[PDB]
Design a protein around this ligand. Sequence first.
Ligand code: HEM
Ligand code: HEM
Ligand SMILES: CN(C)c1cccc(CNCc2ccc3ccc(N)nc3c2)c1
Ligand SMILES: CN(C)c1cccc(CNCc2ccc3ccc(N)nc3c2)c1
Ligand SMILES: C[C@H](O)[C@H](O)[C@H]1CNc2nc(N)[nH]c(=O)c2N1
Ligand SMILES: C[C@H](O)[C@H](O)[C@H]1CNc2nc(N)[nH]c(=O)c2N1
Ligand SMILES: [Cl-]
Ligand SMILES: [Cl-]
Lengths: 362, 362
Amino acid sequence: EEKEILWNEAKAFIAACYQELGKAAEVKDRLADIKSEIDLTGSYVHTKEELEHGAKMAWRNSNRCIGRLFWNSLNVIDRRDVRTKEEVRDALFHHIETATNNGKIRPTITIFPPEEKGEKQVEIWNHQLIRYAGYESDGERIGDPASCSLTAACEELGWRGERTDFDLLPLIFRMKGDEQPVWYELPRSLVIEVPITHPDIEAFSDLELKWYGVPIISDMKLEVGGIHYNAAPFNGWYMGTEIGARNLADEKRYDKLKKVASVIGIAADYNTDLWKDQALVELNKAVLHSYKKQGVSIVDHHTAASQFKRFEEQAEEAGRKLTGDWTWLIPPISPAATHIFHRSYDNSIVKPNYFYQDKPYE
Amino acid sequence: EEKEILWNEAKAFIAACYQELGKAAEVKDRLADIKSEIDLTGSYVHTKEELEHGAKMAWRNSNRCIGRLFWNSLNVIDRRDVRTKEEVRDALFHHIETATNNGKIRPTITIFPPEEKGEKQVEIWNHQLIRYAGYESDGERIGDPASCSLTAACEELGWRGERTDFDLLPLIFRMKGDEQPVWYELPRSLVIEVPITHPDIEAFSDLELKWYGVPIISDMKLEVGGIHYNAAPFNGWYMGTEIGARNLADEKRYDKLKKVASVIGIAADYNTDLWKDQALVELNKAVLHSYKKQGVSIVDHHTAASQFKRFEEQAEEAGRKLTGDWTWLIPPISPAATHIFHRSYDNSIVKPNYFYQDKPYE
Ligand code: HEM
Ligand code: HEM
Ligand SMILES: CN(C)c1cccc(CNCc2ccc3ccc(N)nc3c2)c1
Ligand SMILES: CN(C)c1cccc(CNCc2ccc3ccc(N)nc3c2)c1
Ligand SMILES: C[C@H](O)[C@H](O)[C@H]1CNc2nc(N)[nH]c(=O)c2N1
Ligand SMILES: C[C@H](O)[C@H](O)[C@H]1CNc2nc(N)[nH]c(=O)c2N1
Ligand SMILES: [Cl-]
Ligand SMILES: [Cl-]
């Protein structure tokens, strides 16, 4: 029943993967071994080659990702050998340091042991490995509202935030067999942050905005050939609009546009003045400038779309169908100035891929 | 076969329309008369009430339109009585004058006789009643590229444009029974145009940009209760981004962003400077300012989205399902600053509605 779904996914994945690696001759014997491994054990184990190419294919198939041109240079770290919470913690610390790479960000994924019988071996509670806490009590909002429920769960576990607007959440995860997760403070030496300044407007630093260097998404499931890697944190570098048009701008996040309008010296009184739009552009210019000034990788949305056009061209040249989610591929700033806006994309789901999964808290 | 599709659409429309007008008692007898009219004649004729409410319902059901809050105040002009090309021309001139209303634009639709057996009585060739010509020969681009094929068709018919960037195309339409359409120059006294200036930047007038006041879309088919009104030009007022983010900005339209960047004094050299985004905001601010200064109706995209939220609320309160096309409802400038971006919409097609139809030329 599960052995069948597994075997089917395995056949489809091994054939495609080995074809891409020029190993098509070896498919028959590999499939043989897998068939017997599933019968005898209920699952099968990927070779390091399969796992690495699977994680790359999964990125290539992520419909909502504009950054896919670089799928084949993903740095895959195989941590299927971890058994203890100290090993998990150290692997997550390592991922941070190696992905950060002193600012020259390396797209990286660390892959932990996969689910067995739907039973997780390691369950990561963080949304990203580096993320700010959020607090909301009696009229008072502090930090990142998107982090309120995770922050409250951490404080249930004896963590306590300083209640600045930028408290770093601890790493928090649970091991199989433990009733409760454990948490560990992030060593500050590992976390690069960027203060936001503006190239022309000196007063912009008065807002005391900053953001962290590397987004390391840690709550998605990587599925490859029927094997479910629920713990497999990965990162790229930011596209600037994620920080400037959403994290710092959204009313339900840091909600900074009125403050930006004031420091750039425009009124925030009339919709027809387009002050939100002007403030968005200046905040986004500041974000790109600040990351560049500090030597931390970042891409602007025009360059990102130009790279994505090359991804489309490369897909066609390779004879692979392109899939994509137009609603997520268009940037939230000047979308009609990118080619993405003016074409359509087939939003079909192809595996290997990355998937949402239920939060373990809340 | 056609009588059946017709009767079915008629039943569904009359029931809904009379329910909305509180006339539900009259449905049975009206349906009786319609049934007999279809049998004996192959079609049926709407009452003036049905036609007016049908055109309003069709606007209310237009998934891609952000301006729908005002659906019930559509001004419906019934021109089912026209038989001659002089009457058509005069009705189109009249629509322009009454919709323009000296700048205080009235949303209006003029409805011409409907198709008989799929046979058009009047076939309008213009995309909008007021639109600029476009020319493209040997490296030289003049005017609006989107108008190139219609412009060439007009010049086949003995029209000749002055080849400015803003030549007004003639009205062009064909009567049933004529092999060729006729064309008529627009009287300049009927056409309001707005020069684009910027509230703060004096040099912006150097670009010598202008646009026309009223968009009167004249190539869509209005379908109401199975009756096909292929000729039924309608207008609202502009949302500013249509002019500033698309008509004047698109590379395949007037392509003005590099020129805007230069007059606003920013470099157009580096994607990371976000110069296209900054130029877009300034051009859009100029457009709203210029229309307002001249007393010509226009709405900015924030206010438009706020009105659309009220449309959603009104639909819910009335017990009607809301339908919408998220990809067209989001504005092309700061879309994530509107509520539209953050919710989803059911893109189902409900009739009465407005539909694309095949161009009669090209
Ligand atoms: C190299 C730099 C990268 C850039 C600039 C980039 C850019 C983006 C952006 C802008 C989004 C939209 C998310 C949002 O709007 O919040 C996105 C979505 C996504 N990216 Fe990438 N990305 C990169 C690398 C990666 C990598 C390395 C992976 C995995 C190996 C990945 C997988 C995804 C996935 C799965 C989504 C969709 C997430 C969801 O549905 O919530 N990306 N990417
Ligand atoms: C009162 C002011 C109005 C505003 C501000 C408005 C705004 C808009 C906008 C911005 C669009 C998107 C089109 C584009 O991006 O190029 C649109 C689409 C549309 N509007 Fe409205 N609209 C208004 C009135 C009307 C009226 C009076 C009707 C018909 C009675 C109408 C029917 C439509 C239709 C059918 C579409 C979709 C056209 C297509 O698929 O190409 N609108 N509207
Ligand atoms: C809480 N919140 C705002 C949230 C919650 C769940 C999912 C998301 C969307 N995740 C966006 C995402 C995923 C992968 C990325 C890889 C690289 C990159 N630059 N951005 C990514 C953004 C948000
Ligand atoms: C040539 N071109 C750019 C084109 C061709 C066909 C269809 C369209 C989209 N029409 C947009 C439209 C329709 C109705 C409107 C009513 C009011 C308003 N302010 N804008 C409208 C825009 C474009
Ligand atoms: C195919 C693709 O979705 C297409 O470019 C659409 C996107 N949404 C749009 N939205 C508006 N308002 N106008 C357009 O012309 C388009 N084009
Ligand atoms: C439901 C609705 O489509 C939703 O708000 C989407 C739109 N597209 C998006 N695109 C990105 N990049 N990020 C988002 O959070 C969303 N939200
Ligand atoms: Cl983020
Ligand atoms: Cl237009």
